[PDB]
Design an enzyme around this catalytic site. Structure first.
Site, PDB file in Angstrom:
ATOM      1  N   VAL A  26      40.043  39.895  38.013  1.00  0.00           N
ATOM      2  CA  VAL A  26      40.830  38.936  38.686  1.00  0.00           C
ATOM      3  C   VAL A  26      41.309  37.980  37.474  1.00  0.00           C
ATOM      4  O   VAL A  26      42.747  37.485  37.425  1.00  0.00           O
ATOM      5  CB  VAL A  26      40.498  37.931  39.868  1.00  0.00           C
ATOM      6  N   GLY A  27      40.569  37.581  36.616  1.00  0.00           N
ATOM      7  CA  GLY A  27      40.785  36.723  35.422  1.00  0.00           C
ATOM      8  C   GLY A  27      40.042  37.017  34.265  1.00  0.00           C
ATOM      9  O   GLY A  27      38.732  37.586  34.431  1.00  0.00           O
ATOM     10  N   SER A  28      40.320  36.392  32.979  1.00  0.00           N
ATOM     11  CA  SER A  28      39.574  36.194  31.733  1.00  0.00           C
ATOM     12  C   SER A  28      40.099  35.429  30.740  1.00  0.00           C
ATOM     13  O   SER A  28      41.229  35.141  30.842  1.00  0.00           O
ATOM     14  CB  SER A  28      39.949  37.662  31.093  1.00  0.00           C
ATOM     15  N   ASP A 164      38.383  22.690  39.901  1.00  0.00           N
ATOM     16  CA  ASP A 164      38.325  22.478  38.472  1.00  0.00           C
ATOM     17  C   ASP A 164      37.220  21.339  38.089  1.00  0.00           C
ATOM     18  O   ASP A 164      37.701  20.046  38.053  1.00  0.00           O
ATOM     19  CB  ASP A 164      39.911  22.102  37.997  1.00  0.00           C
TER      20      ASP A 164
HETATM   21  N1  PO6 Z   1      34.010  25.194  37.981  1.00  0.00           N
HETATM   22  C1  PO6 Z   1      35.243  25.176  38.566  1.00  0.00           C
HETATM   23  O1  PO6 Z   1      36.030  24.478  38.989  1.00  0.00           O
HETATM   24  C2  PO6 Z   1      35.402  26.883  39.054  1.00  0.00           C
HETATM   25  O2  PO6 Z   1      34.253  27.417  38.867  1.00  0.00           O
HETATM   26  C3  PO6 Z   1      34.289  28.742  39.203  1.00  0.00           C
HETATM   27  C4  PO6 Z   1      35.347  29.679  39.377  1.00  0.00           C
HETATM   28  C5  PO6 Z   1      35.259  30.892  39.997  1.00  0.00           C
HETATM   29  C6  PO6 Z   1      33.812  31.223  40.404  1.00  0.00           C
HETATM   30  C7  PO6 Z   1      32.802  30.470  40.191  1.00  0.00           C
HETATM   31  C8  PO6 Z   1      32.910  29.293  39.833  1.00  0.00           C
HETATM   32 MG    MG Z   2      41.891  21.104  34.003  1.00  0.00          MG
END
Ligand code: PO6
Ligand code: MG
Ligand code: CL
Ligand code: CL
Ligand code: CL
Ligand code: CL
Ligand code: CL
Length: 348
Positions: A26-28, A164
């Site tokens: 889904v992302g990288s 975030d």
């Molecule tokens: N640290 C964030 O705000 C987002 O963190 C994650 C993003 C996706 C899956 C697990 C953790």
């Molecule tokens: Mg930010």
């Protein structure tokens, strides 16, 4: 310990508990990789993030620890929570990889603000939820710093969560030019005027609320200076009281080079909006951060009369962030992180 299985996902070996099925990228980026999956234990669609190089330097090891501590603390309907955290390692000696699991988010605010026609009722409910989550975040002495439409997840029923926490501090290059990464920032943090505090987040909420009401970015500056001129044309140039609070002599000198301007009439800027919305925007978008409305005060404003329930706006357990001023070695931050992985208790 669950059983783990291995698979190669676009250049990366993922090792995850059997409960997580149908992994798909889904992302990288620099930070690592995200896959969508189906969690057979809970029935939820989830996001699984594999951190890249979590312990590669003192700065990276401390960053990893910070993200895990913040995600483990946040237990609120309007904030990201942690569903699971795991490592395939069977001891501290073999610990290298960290995986985080949360609810899979579809649409962000951008996906509905850009396209949908929003009623005043939609703006009331969306901003109410952001302020309900912020009252919780601020009660733990956590500052978000980066509220913006791309950090707000919204579902078909208009229910919202804030995103975030504990990611890499934004770079000078990332804040340069015609960029959404700067348009929602409070002026005192954009220009390093003074030691900032949680009041920066209320400036960002005002910028988001204006954009939901108009469909247009409030301060789309082409650079830091163009953006300050747009802000001062709306709220007015600073008076002697705020200028004294700008600890930076050079920043104080530059502000005083600008011709003085009065605050504009917000009913003539936000033409046709609910008068109660106009009143709330005047209390958020105040140049002196000491004088801005707080999240707790804003929830009691008449704009939210249909949603406000002072018995269902909870506060956070205390959050110990003494680690933030601590100097440790790479392996010491790695050991603290390992203890937080093995001590995780999943939600009810
Ligand atoms: N640290 C964030 O705000 C987002 O963190 C994650 C993003 C996706 C899956 C697990 C953790
Ligand atoms: Mg930010
Ligand atoms: Cl399992
Ligand atoms: Cl969540
Ligand atoms: Cl590992
Ligand atoms: Cl955004
Ligand atoms: Cl704590």
């Amino acid at each position: 310990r669950p059983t783990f299985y291995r698979q190669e996902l676009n250049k990366t070996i993922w090792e995850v508990p059997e409960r997580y099925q149908n992994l798909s990228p889904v992302g990288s980026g620099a930070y690592g990789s995200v896959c969508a999956a189906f969690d057979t234990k809970t029935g939820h669609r989830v996001a699984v993030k594999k951190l890249s190089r979590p312990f590669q330097s003192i700065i990276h090891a401390k960053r990893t620890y910070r993200e895990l501590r913040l995600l483990k603390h946040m237990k609120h309907e309007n904030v990201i929570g942690l569903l699971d955290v795991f490592t395939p390692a069977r001891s501290l000696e073999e610990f290298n990889d960290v995986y985080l699991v949360t609810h899979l988010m579809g649409a962000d605010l951008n996906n509905i603000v850009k396209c949908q026609k929003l009623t005043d009722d939609h703006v009331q409910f969306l901003i109410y939820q952001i302020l309900r989550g912020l009252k919780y975040i601020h009660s733990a002495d956590i500052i978000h710093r980066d509220l913006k439409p791309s950090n707000l997840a919204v579902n078909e029923d208009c229910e919202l969560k804030i995103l975030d926490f504990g990611l890499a501090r934004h770079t000078d290059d990332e804040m340069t030019g015609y960029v959404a990464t700067r348009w929602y920032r409070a002026p005192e943090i954009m220009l390093n005027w003074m030691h900032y505090n949680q009041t920066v987040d209320i400036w960002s909420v005002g910028c988001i609320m204006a954009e939901l009401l108009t469909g247009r970015t409030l301060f789309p500056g082409t650079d830091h200076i163009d953006q300050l001129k747009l802000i001062l044309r709306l709220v007015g140039t600073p008076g002697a009281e705020l200028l004294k609070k700008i600890s930076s002599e050079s920043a104080r000198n530059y502000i005083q080079s600008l011709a003085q301007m009065p605050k504009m009439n917000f009913a003539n800027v936000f033409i046709g909006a609910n008068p109660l919305a106009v009143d709330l925007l005047e209390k958020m978008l105040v140049l002196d951060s000491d004088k801005r409305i707080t999240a707790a005060q804003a929830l009691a404003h008449a704009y939210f009369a249909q949603y406000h329930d002072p018995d269902d706006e909870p506060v956070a357990d205390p959050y110990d962030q003494s680690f933030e001023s601590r100097d440790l070695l790479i392996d010491e931050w790695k050991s603290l992180t390992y203890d937080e992985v093995i001590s995780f208790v999943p939600p009810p």
